[PDB]
């Protein structure tokens, strides 16, 4: 997997059709995913674990 | 009576929760997984 591939991106449980979106890949070190914070509204997500 | 027993086997070969008569147990005392149950349910075939 390399830079600029389009991957599907999902959180459970998905409700409205905005909880499954395709992002562009960007390789980074360490062990966690990364999100721009502006996409925390359709996912109903927060970084508290 | 034995023929009725054969009817009972053919019955519990496709249904275990036959309302009306006790569940045919395993050797170790647990209810047998009749075919009717591999399918229905959240964890069967058509959901799982």
């Amino acid at each position: 997997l390399m830079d600029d591939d389009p991957v599907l991106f999902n959180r459970q449980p998905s409700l409205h059709k905005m909880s499954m979106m395709a992002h562009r890949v960007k390789v980074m070190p360490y062990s966690t995913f990364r999100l721009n914070l502006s996409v925390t509204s359709p996912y109903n997500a927060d970084f508290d674990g | 009576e034995v023929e009725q027993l054969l009817q009972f086997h053919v019955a519990t070969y496709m249904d275990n929760d036959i309302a009306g008569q006790p569940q045919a147990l395993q050797k170790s005392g647990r209810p047998v997984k009749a075919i009717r149950a591999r399918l229905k349910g959240k964890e069967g075939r058509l959901r799982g």
């Binding site: 459970q12 449980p13 499954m20 | -």
Partner: protein
């Protein structure tokens, strides 16, 4: 890949992505069937054709 994510990928409309997710990337299989009776009871042999 729960039923709800299936509902979402129906909401987007990507039918090819679904046909993929539920075939190649899981469990594909092939069956030789007849055309008169219509059952999966065909006795087949390939290297003898």
């Amino acid at each position: 890949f729960g039923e709800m994510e299936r509902d979402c990928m129906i909401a987007h409309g990507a039918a090819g992505f679904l046909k993929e997710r539920l075939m190649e990337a899981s469990d594909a299989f092939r069956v030789h069937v007849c055309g008169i009776c219509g059952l999966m009871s065909v006795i087949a042999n390939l290297k003898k054709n």
